[PDB]
Amino acid sequence: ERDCRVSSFRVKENFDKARFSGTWYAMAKKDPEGLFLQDNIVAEFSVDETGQMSATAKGRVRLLNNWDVCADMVGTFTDTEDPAKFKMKYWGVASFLQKGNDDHWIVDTDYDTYAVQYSCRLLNLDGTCADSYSFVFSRDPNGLPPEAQKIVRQRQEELCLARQYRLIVHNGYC
Numbered sequence: 060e061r062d063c064r065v066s067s068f069r070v071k072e073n074f075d076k077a078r079f080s081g082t083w084y085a086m087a088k089k090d091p092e093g094l095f096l097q098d099n100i101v102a103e104f105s106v107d108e109t110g111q112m113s114a115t116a117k118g119r120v121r122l123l124n125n126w127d128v129c130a131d132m133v134g135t136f137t138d139t140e141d142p143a144k145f146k147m148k149y150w151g152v153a154s155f156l157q158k159g160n161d162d163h164w165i166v167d168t169d170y171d172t173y174a175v176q177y178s179c180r181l182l183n184l185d186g187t188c189a190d191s192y193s194f195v196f197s198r199d200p201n202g203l204p205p206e207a208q209k210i211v212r213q214r215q216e217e218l219c220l221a222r223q224y225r226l227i228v229h230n231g232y233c
């Protein structure tokens with residue numbers, strides 16, 4: 060019945076940059092087109108004294124040569140007039156790691172258990188997203204409570220990304 064246009068997706072009301080600080084463990088993922096981080100993904104969100112948020116992401120990526128680098132990614136976030144929607148500039152500490160600029164939307168979080176991020180890299184002419192990625196973060200390395208799980212699938216369906224996530228392995232590779 061409802062809207063898959065990106066312009067219509069609801070995000071986190073009055074997103075608190077500081078309450079989202081710290082370690083988030085990626086539990087689930089919806090991959091974009093091309094090369095992306097595979098597994099072992101752990102982000103560290105941070106806010107300095109002026110309200111600027113940054114993050115570091117750690118994760119394993121398989122490069123064409125068939126490398127298995129544990130990428131150390133850095134992202135800085137630019138605020139928009141929506142508190143839960145950011146522009147994220149990112150780069151690897153290694154030169155070979157992918158650099159870019161993506162939207163970063165906090166679709167929902169309760170700050171202490173779960174987060175849902177989304178990024179549409181490209182919009183179709185109808186307003187829907189032709190290439191997106193999404194992550195489901197957990198405060199706990201062992202996942203989400205049945206409770207958090209129900210809300211998170213609700214949100215996935217809302218993002219028109221239901222049934223398009225795969226679980227993330229964490230086996231200490233990095």
Ligand SMILES: CC1=C(/C=C/C(C)=C/C=C/C(C)=C/CO)C(C)(C)CCC1
Nearest residue numbers: 094095102114116120132133134149157
């Ligand atoms: C920086 C950053 C993030 C995104 C990282 C990406 C998109 C990395 C891609 C790396 C690639 C494609 C390497 C290829 O060799 C997420 C959203 C986790 C939040 C934390 C900060």
